[PDB]
Amino acid sequence: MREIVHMQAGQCGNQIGAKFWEVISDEHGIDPTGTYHGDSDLQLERINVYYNEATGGKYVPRAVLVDLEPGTMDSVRSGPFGQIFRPDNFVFGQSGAGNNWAKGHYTEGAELVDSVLDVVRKEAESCDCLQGFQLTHSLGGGTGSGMGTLLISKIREEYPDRIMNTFSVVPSPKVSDTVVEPYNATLSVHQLVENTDETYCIDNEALYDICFRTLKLTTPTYGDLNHLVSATMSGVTTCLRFPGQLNADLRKLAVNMVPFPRLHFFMPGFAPLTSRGSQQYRALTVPELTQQMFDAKNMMAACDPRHGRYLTVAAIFRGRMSMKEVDEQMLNVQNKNSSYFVEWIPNNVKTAVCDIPPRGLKMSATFIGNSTAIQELFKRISEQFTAMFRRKAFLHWYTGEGMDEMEFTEAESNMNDLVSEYQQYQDATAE
């Protein structure tokens, strides 16, 4: 059986990973102390994808938590579902990243990266088939950006065949919350490009938007944001753990989803999302699942999908459905607006129907979208980066940490080349 090794990097990555293990532990009937209080054989059938078998009935998560501060990892260990992890794959440093990509990638994240490679190598060699790696971080700081990209590069050099998905919370200009955030994003997107096989770009302002206008909720809170991100992550990887009519692994998603290798930035989704008042006023059906999943609100990136063209769409359904209705709804949402679809790729929709809907739901669905509207995100990142870099603002940290303004310029040139590639792939005619 195949395996996924989880890697949480940074504060945001550690919080999202803790919530992710919290949701896939009671998706699999795993109590906080580690045993299996399930109620079906199907939960225990495919538990080795994420949980290593240990002493007794204790199923230990196969995740490595990294951070260059004794902060959020102490928070995870103290919080609920924090005792499932081994005390060995909690590698962390007493220093500080300083929200500095140079410190995270070259300076004091490089003396612990060898220990992280030791731990991840130990888990990967203890795996049986090792389908690939799942890494969660953010392009807005130190440990998330620099340490995470160093980890992705080293794992890519060690195993240049296995699947690599990185989720990553992309910076927002409205949320902000960090000043050197455009530098940390611009200097790390390029390092993501040639290493990650697929990246499911998450955005905080889009999470706030879907909480505001779909789940109401008044006060959304990072806990609910992490629950929603973890729900979409579990919807992405549900086909490895539950049997279904029409299976699709991460490799099938990549092969049917990314057309050209530097086009692997996706728009995730999920569409059972009703307010508490409006939960009982909707007859949960495949048509409204499809239309909510293809609604422009439900996308978790700030880029609007009507401003570009969908290169590919993947939709992973969970529950018991009818394949005629599923395929008919996919065809209908393609045919009503085929204008927001590339003409040179006929039938760019990849359906994956699996059984066993998530706990407490009749039927669910999750979305992955490769569209050319994702160039706008990098354009806003670029226009912030050049505004800060034109006056050499905040560059003394990066320069005195041992970097180059020519390296900054070449990272910017790489991101503009990627933007131009998306632009011409959008504007390419059928023949």
Binding site: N195, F260, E421, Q424
Partner: peptide, 26 residues
């Protein structure tokens, strides 16, 4: 700006596939 259409068309004929190989044969 370089024509990525013809770039990838020649790259798959040269047998490069991965994105690092793409950028190095650029």
């Amino acid at each position: 700006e370089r024509d990525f259409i013809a770039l990838n068309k020649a790259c798959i004929g040269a047998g490069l596939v991965t994105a690092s190989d793409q950028f190095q044969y650029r």
